[PDB]
Symmetry: D2
Subunit: 303 residues, 4 copies
Amino acid sequence: MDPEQIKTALGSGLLSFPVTHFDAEGRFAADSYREHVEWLAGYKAPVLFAAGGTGEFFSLKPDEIPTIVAAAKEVAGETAIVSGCGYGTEIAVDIARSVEKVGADGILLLPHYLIDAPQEGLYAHIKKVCQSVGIGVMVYNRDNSVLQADTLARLCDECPNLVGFKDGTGDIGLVRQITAKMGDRLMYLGGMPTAELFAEAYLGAGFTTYSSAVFNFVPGLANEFYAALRAGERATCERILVDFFYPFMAIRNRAKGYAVSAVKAGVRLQGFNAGPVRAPLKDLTNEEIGMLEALIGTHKRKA
Amino acid sequence: MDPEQIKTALGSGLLSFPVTHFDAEGRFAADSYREHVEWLAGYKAPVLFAAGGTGEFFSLKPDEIPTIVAAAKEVAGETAIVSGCGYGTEIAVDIARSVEKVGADGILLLPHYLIDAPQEGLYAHIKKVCQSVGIGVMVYNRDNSVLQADTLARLCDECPNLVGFKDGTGDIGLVRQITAKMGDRLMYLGGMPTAELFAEAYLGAGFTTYSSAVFNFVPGLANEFYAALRAGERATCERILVDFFYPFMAIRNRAKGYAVSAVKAGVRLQGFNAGPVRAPLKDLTNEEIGMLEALIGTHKR
Amino acid sequence: MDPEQIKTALGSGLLSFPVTHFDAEGRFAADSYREHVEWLAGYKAPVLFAAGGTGEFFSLKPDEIPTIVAAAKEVAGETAIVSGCGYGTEIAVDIARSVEKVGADGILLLPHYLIDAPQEGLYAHIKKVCQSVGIGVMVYNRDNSVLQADTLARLCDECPNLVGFKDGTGDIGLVRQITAKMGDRLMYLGGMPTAELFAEAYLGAGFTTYSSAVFNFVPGLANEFYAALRAGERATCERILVDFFYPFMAIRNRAKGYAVSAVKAGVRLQGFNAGPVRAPLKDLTNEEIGMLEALIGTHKRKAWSHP
Amino acid sequence: MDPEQIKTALGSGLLSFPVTHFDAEGRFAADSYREHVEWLAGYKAPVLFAAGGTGEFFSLKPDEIPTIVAAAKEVAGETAIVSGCGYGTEIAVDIARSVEKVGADGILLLPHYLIDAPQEGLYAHIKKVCQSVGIGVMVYNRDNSVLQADTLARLCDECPNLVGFKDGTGDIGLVRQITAKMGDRLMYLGGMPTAELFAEAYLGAGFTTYSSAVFNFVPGLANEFYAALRAGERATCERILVDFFYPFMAIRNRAKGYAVSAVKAGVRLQGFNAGPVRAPLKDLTNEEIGMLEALIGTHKRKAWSHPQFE
């Protein structure tokens, strides 16, 4: 689809970021991945982000990314498919063009690698990546890549296919300035780890959707929270925060990287063969897996 | 005033934090202060925080604080008066008791001095301050004093006069957890510098009021933004953000401490003899003062 | 003494920062304090910092500080006595003048309260404090008060009684620039928590002394480390780091504020009635006190020792 | 070269990290690179790190790295050549094996990409990279990859080819613990931006060498500072800090990334046209380059003929 079509899809519901399934040896496990993506499709997220952060983009070889995107496309149905992209410009452009070739509907551009960079340099890097493909681009403010509002405005003026903005900073002051400046030029995507913790506040900032990492393993629960959010049903949102998300957060905060590892553990507990995380992430301990299993509780998919 | 009455006042509108006026000899200028507070009273903020952060609490002698609270009480009329309080426990308790004596309706407890502290220690410190007075207390998550939700819950169970929670961290994740845990047990007060930049997001977190530092010199505009906020008139809030608050923010970000210095400059531009900031703050340059004057524009008094 | 005399004292050995003793009613326990200080005096630190950070300056009422300084001065012998000082300018000047009045030999100026401040404001604040007294002043780079080299040079040019610089930032790049700029105009004092962890590196930065917080309860060991440091006996320094200081660090890192709490626990373990820390610090758990007791080990204060 | 031989070379002097030269089309410019490396060779740094941070590792396509290493090897003489390496494990292993194939004498392992990771994960990642090659490895504590002493000890016990430790954290407390723990098991390399600012302090921590980024364009000055450092000649070190390094730092601090961009400008000023930096770095303005030119001053290795008519 064209960038305006992926833009419309970004504003039509909740965003799904599937974990990437690996076998015991760490290789991509396409059959298990497709089984899980097919199961998630029943819950009708309008956009699927293949090989995003939750999908361990940062541990994939560039040549693996189109294979993962193609696998998702096999079974995702009438769903927009966005690919992760990232690293420095040379690598990012090659990844972008490779996933465009296998039929991705857009790219989510993760930070460049390692260095702190001046705004002018961020502009030049992101412009070059946007101009390398015809599909839609979402930029991702996080870590060592944080666009100021004026820099983002310049990019929007020069790159018509730049259509989305994902925030992973939690900087409420900055993101409100960005939505005030750009208005409906961009779709605004919440991108904090466990984004439901931020979603009610981010409404006021101008964000009405987000990545739901836990949709990987409790999509019914994630969909219900999202529905309550958009309906203004505060007591329902709050009940789900108190009974599910703050307990999940307690597990997540036990170790670095568990924003991904705990989500992948949840997928395994629901009976999908998602396999291990790749180093330098680590998997949950048996004790922690037990905690998560108990938390999932009434939401188990099987016995 | 009993804690439940200050609690009600905290939920009845916008919060005012007047700058503290100093004269040429550097002392508190009570006549000038009272003139400014009397003018602000016309704009009907339900609660006035004397000697808070915007009032340069951090540069005041403990014995100056009751004097400032007393001056505010003279002219505030039907307005609740909350006093700043802070430092370590021994000093804080002395301040708290001293301002209760001159008629403060509550205290806002700023962080203790210098050190990073464990949750159990914050608990012990804040509990001792709360139990030293009968008036209402508002805690203030900021810098080296950040309460977790479970610690604040314990304080609420133990200290009935603890009735307010002010946030200066900007940690949306944490403050949403706090409002979910405590519910209507506490009044939630936005406390970021230039809090209007955060107000719409903080609604969703569970906060419907905040300190408006710029109410000091453009109270009419601050009231206009607040009314639009509570009415859900986003285009109006956004217009005021774009036309006033982000340009103000640009001036404020030129130097450390200007969250206070620029506000005080604004007060002087409106014809109040608020005087200089105390070191280690520094005042705006003449050029910067000119920028602020131009920004205030048609809100000139 | 005059500023040049305290300056000379700062360069004559290891720096002592006694914990402040509190009684059951929470009050300053002067008898116990004086007893502890008298014991420490036997280990010959040339400068004693009363009511510094380790002495819980940040939890003292201002009127308590001259009482504490006076108590240390009574029993410290021929030892320079420096008082903690801090907060905003108005409070700091009052504190400074009050401790000068009871015969403090200098002040260590802790950061102002709460706010971040422009360099020009730091300059104005510190200058006013220095000019309020005739005794020597040591500035203290840490937290929300960090002087750049040019700002400090300006203060040195205008305040002759400013004679010392303590670092609590751990910013090697900055502190080396400072010593290159000022040279022997200032005495440079290491001020990291558990400063022995930094001492060998700080030598190259231009610092040959530091506050030894653990001197409070193992003054012999602290002296042994300092002696080896100044003599270039790396194997000895390293042994003490591996056997004592990194294990101490493990205890210290278990909770916020334990850089003070664990030291006070050590003092109590060695038989000085220092009492609890004041909130918002917390004391070590019994389990943690147990860990510190084992670590002190052969350095335990024994009834049969000769003074 | 085996790992014990590169370990020995790491302890034999100052470390060189050449900028990577690009042409106007952005491509690696091997002829220019070799000319610059050949000039540097006269100053006899025992180890050259090709495609390190100063060499814009983070902006290279993985297939460029062996090409750059091979070019340096052409003209480096009897100098050890270490290659940059980095990213997540899968990419890092491919890079490591590719540069081993072209004859690198070791790899400097930069952080993995993006994420904060637990110590056990860092261990698993670095172990896998070390076991993928037979050449020497130096780990690099910086940004999102900071090994604690006990984790590093486990890596040392299991990976004999891990022989070096480079610090970019500036955490004196931690690095002194690490040298106390490992002793001569590892060679300790200073790795701060503009490492001369840290070198005297780092001696005490146990580090007697470092990467000198400015060696790229004032190697005579960098060599003199290093000799003074090792000799204990404090007044010489201090003069060079005051007259050159703190003024350099003032230029460097003008914008993000100038720790690389300013060094590359210096190389260009000395007559080696190393070309532009790759985005998202930005080059110094012509005004800023003029500031650096004035600072280089008596240390210029050429005179320019600027265009002028009548």
